[PDB]
């Protein structure tokens, strides 16, 4: 369908001793497929999906070398940023970086992105044109001028529109049994007599993939937002996701309420209602 490849990098400085803690994770859609952890014993980029394990030693060597170079760049950046923001050498600070590409249903390039944050705030990001930079403040403006001088956006655009897309298509092909399979939500409704004259109806969506889903309640065919609670979509831990939406209703009026589920895995939206015998 529509697909994405994204890499996430986090470095956290350790002022007391040694290098920053560095964690890198790679995703295809909502599936983690590679990781690097500076605290792990291997010091190698490691596979996290069965379809990436078929890649040869040249692949793992290359990914390890690049990810280690990312770690060193973030180590130097943490020092640079401490200087730009006139901060002490005693505190712990964080740099985060995310980049990746999206392809449409025809597996052609849709968009690319490259964003960087310092202490959890936007620092500098590549604009959607893949040619220019958004600098959030004057420290990031200094970086923007350096990156303009070093042809950074050209090299990123070449990777995001070329390499990133070409490898994403390879991964989608190699991992087709899972990456291209949609897992429609397994739905059910629960009923919880919550007070004296009311009951909570909870509409569950389980074991679904990808994570994107919409759960909405209706009362007599009209959207109900009052007395509703929607939890954030959460990982089941087996690669699938879960979500629930609840509404508090007067007892005896349950049949007026319907839960509607929309997901990529459902050719027609699903409607659930509480049956009074259960």
């Amino acid at each position: 369908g529509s697909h994405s490849m994204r890499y996430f990098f986090t470095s956290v400085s350790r002022p007391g001793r040694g290098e920053p803690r560095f964690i890198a994770v790679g995703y295809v859609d909502d599936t983690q497929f590679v990781r690097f952890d500076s605290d792990a014993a291997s010091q190698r980029m490691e596979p996290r999906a069965p379809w990436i394990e078929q890649e040869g030693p040249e692949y793992w060597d290359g990914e390890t070398r690049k990810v280690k170079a990312h770690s060193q760049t973030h180590r130097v950046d943490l020092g640079t940023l401490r200087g730009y923001y006139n901060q002490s050498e005693a505190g712990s600070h964080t740099v985060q970086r995310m980049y990746g590409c999206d392809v449409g249903s025809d597996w052609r390039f849709l968009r690319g992105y490259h964003q960087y944050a310092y202490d959890g705030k936007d620092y500098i990001a590549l604009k959607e044109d893949l040619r220019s930079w958004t600098a959030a403040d004057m420290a990031a403006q200094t970086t923007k001028h350096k990156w303009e001088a070093a042809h950074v956006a050209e090299q990123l655009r070449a990777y995001l529109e070329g390499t990133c897309v070409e490898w994403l298509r390879r991964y989608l092909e190699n991992g087709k049994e899972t990456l291209q399979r949609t897992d429609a939500p397994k739905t059910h409704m629960t009923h919880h007599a919550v007070s004296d004259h009311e009951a909570t109806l909870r509409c569950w969506a389980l074991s679904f993939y990808p994570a994107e889903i919409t759960l909405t309640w209706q009362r007599d065919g009209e959207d109900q937002t009052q007395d509703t609670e929607l939890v954030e979509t959460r990982p089941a831990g087996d690669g699938t996701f879960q979500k629930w939406a609840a509404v508090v209703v007067p007892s005896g009026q349950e049949q007026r309420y319907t839960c509607h589920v929309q997901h990529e895995g459902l050719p027609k939206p699903l409607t659930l209602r509480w049956e009074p015998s259960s």
Binding site: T73, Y84, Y116, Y159
Partner: peptide
């Protein structure tokens, strides 16, 4: 595959 040219801020 990850990007090859990350540059200093």
């Amino acid at each position: 595959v990850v990007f090859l040219h990350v540059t200093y801020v």
